[PDB]
Amino acid sequence: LCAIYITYAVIISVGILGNAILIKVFFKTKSMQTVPNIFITSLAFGDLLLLLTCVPVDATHYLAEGWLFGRIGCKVLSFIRLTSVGVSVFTLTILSADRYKAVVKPLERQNAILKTCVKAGCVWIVSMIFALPEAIFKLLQEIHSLLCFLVFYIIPLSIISVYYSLIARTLYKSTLNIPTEEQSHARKQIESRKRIARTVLVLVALFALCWLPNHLLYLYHSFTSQTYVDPSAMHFIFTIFSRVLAFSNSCVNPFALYWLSKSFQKHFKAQLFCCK
Amino acid sequence: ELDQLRQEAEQLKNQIRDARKACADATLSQITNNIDPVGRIQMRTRRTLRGHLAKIYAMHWGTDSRLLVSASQDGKLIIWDSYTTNKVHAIPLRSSWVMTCAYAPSGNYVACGGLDNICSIYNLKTREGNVRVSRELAGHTGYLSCCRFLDDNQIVTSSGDTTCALWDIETGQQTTTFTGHTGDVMSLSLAPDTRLFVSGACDASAKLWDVREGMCRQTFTGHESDINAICFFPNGNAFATGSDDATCRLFDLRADQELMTYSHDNIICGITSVSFSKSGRLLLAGYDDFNCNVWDALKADRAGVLAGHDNRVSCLGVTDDGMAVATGSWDSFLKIWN
Amino acid sequence: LSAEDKAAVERSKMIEKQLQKDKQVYRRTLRLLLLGADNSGKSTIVKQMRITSGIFETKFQVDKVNFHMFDVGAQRDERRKWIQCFNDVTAIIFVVDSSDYNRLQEALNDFKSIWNNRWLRTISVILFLNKQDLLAEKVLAGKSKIEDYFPEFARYTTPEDATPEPGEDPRVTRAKYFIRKEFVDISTASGDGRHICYPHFTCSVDTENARRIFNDCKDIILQMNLREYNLV
């Protein structure tokens, strides 16, 4: 009865493990400390925060022990959760923009850490600012807050979508210039380029379809209705699957890079065997 | 005739080998085993230079241990203030592919060279204030591998043409030409007394050269590969060589043979630079393993490891007064150790 | 802090600003090394690219990006020392005389040596098989057969996926593709994939020659960026 908690814990654990191994690779391997890698570890830390904050939230929400587990505690917990969500979205769009600049405009290749780290810090500060409205919690207030959240989810969605579309277009177009007559290694290179081109269009979908249910549910609970007149069976499955899909992207973000880079696969497997 | 000359040369080589082996009564190790061990030398980076853009390929310590010159492939020579880390002079080079640089003893001129085959000596005490090319002498048929000042008017330079020469700055012409190396010259170091200088080439051998007489006094063939690094012992009587074989060898001009070979199994990468300390016990040699190693001139044991640099350490030098050590690597970040 | 020390720090900051300003120009320009034997028509290629000096810096711009092509032709035959500093460059332009069958073996050996070089194991080589017109005329005249120099040519069939240009004689196409396959195999053997060879056919009057270098450099920089961003 109610075996959904098994998949919940499985997803949470695998995502936490992936992000932990990612940060371990970043901190342990000198090669993975380059400028473009700092945004990746920033996204990993954001995912870690999101997962470790949603862990106690799920327990406190259900029958566990009472209405909640403290007022200030739940307040700060929701604050940090929203901050982590914003950090994740901002870091995803920033990584998309960086990949665009690097693949679509490769001739403009810069980089120093004192700039990209400052951009990451500004992203974190902006996420914290956008999270401030949670520190205080009329229906209009919540409706407008959730509409702003929907816009803050759609704008990153649209920009990431267009950036990855341009990435895939340049990658597919970047197959006729490379000679392919007698070089099998060039053929492997073309295949890997097509692979990354497909992976970006898979990631855009695994982000959109995964983050859409959560915002849709939050808007349904605020705009169409604002009073829990009574529980509902469909509500439970709906919200639990919405949270599972939300955690799916945070958990697969590292797995995408794992699928992409072979050296990153080597480092990930090494750190996994090490932590064993 | 040719056969007679060949047989005479072979007999002379055999006689030289026999005479060298006869004096091999004991090795430096046997005599240096009774001395106390040098122990571990844990060096720390005191200063980090973040000015150079391209790979740092050369450097040299002037008479004053406060100013440090270093060359980069971007065509920039920055006179670094080791104490305050400030930048004294920036010298835009006409030739980007610079591979050598030296700081004159008087502290007024600085030389350089590379693939352009033209040694440009920059005066740092010009009455006009800006750095100007004092003498852009040339004449070599190969890339300049190393350059070192002997005085305010004389400078010796090595070239890829397998021959060295002493240049007259004022006259701007070769004072004397040194020949004998079969391979391209790569390293050059001046003796403390300024009387003699030793240089290495792509050939697995070294030669001692005299500044006053255009001839070599001794020839060392105790090498297995190209000798890329060399340095005169502080006393001027011996010198250590560095080659891609990953093994350092200490040669003494008075003994005229190898005394001690610093080698290890786990060290497979070649050697690019070698330098001695004021006391001579610390033999600092750079390796292509992205880190420098310090060997004991007497015990031959590894004194320490400098893993600060992340890229190939190509150049390194110790201060004259013996207060700090500079190490330049291709990572464009020069780290000073003390 | 003393006044003199503060002014020294100020001048150091000025020099740092100058270095940072020059860094943008440095990293914005693409460096290229031009290699080839004396028989190769590298000089002709350089002369066509009009879009005891041990170094000959040639600068040309194509599509609003600057290219720095370096030609080392005034140095000894030995190159295992100065070739090292040319690492980290965008690409290496290697020119071979495809018409001269005699020096073709030496050119192949030199290309193999350069490819398997330690410090250049991460730099791509742009291979321009120059003098295609002379090769075509020779193979058409039938006076010199490649079989005399390369026995494998006798048992080599034209690639099925090849795209012969309009008006190309079967013998000319087969010979050029055989040479191209030989070079691609020499580059593939012991090739860890970190660097790829970009073979191209160049002529004496071909105007569309710099576009090849532009495309090769852009592809190489794109692949390097993909490797840096851990996308491959």
Added chain:
Amino acid sequence: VQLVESGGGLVQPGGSRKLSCSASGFAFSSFGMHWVRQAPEKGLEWVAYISSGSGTIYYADTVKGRFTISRDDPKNTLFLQMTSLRSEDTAMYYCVRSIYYYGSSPFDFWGQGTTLTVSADIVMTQATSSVPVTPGESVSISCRSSKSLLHSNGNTYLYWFLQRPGQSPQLLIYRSNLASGVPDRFSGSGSGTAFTLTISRLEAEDVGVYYCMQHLEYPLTFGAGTKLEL
């Protein structure tokens, strides 16, 4: 190297005038310029300073606010805008270049100077204002400072200048160190607060007014001047 100042003349109280100095024979961009005045029949006094690239600008308390210094590197020219000129500001202003780095010689070149006929700071006191001496004799000049000029970096920021009659000041010592072109007969030594300038063998051309200067703090104070009469 040559510095030619211009813009001097008669100006009434409360007026405004802009002095201009044209630099040539050196990299004006890399040299920081100083302004030093010399009232008629009196010692020297620092006016203002502008660093390379116009990053650091300073002014003396006696002129701060009224005078503003500016430079135009593209034309190799210096400017000193003067407003509300006071009768006490009547003095001859000398333009001086300075480049700061280890082993440098600040205040090594002094311009020809321009005359303007209108209408805490470390204090330096010299032994005597005049010292009659015969040629060939060994002359010793001394001065005292109110604060130790020996900084923690071991550098003694003392300067010595010689202004021959009818000529601009000339640098002799910029720290014991001898300036370029100065004969070896000149030598400098002193403690943290006691200083001494020695002339091993005085020449006919060595007569003039010797001015000292402290450079530990930018409020530069020049000595009262010590004349050597033949």
Added chain:
Amino acid sequence: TASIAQARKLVEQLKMEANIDRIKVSKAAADLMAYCEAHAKEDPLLTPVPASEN
């Protein structure tokens, strides 16, 4: 002409390099060690020093 020239040059080189005074390696090694003990008290890093002088 050129072959015999370089041959005689190398012959003279080896001749001048052969007639060179030498000494036993033991004495040369013992003398070299004397410099270390005479300058070990001023080696840049053989002995530590406080940061005040740095």
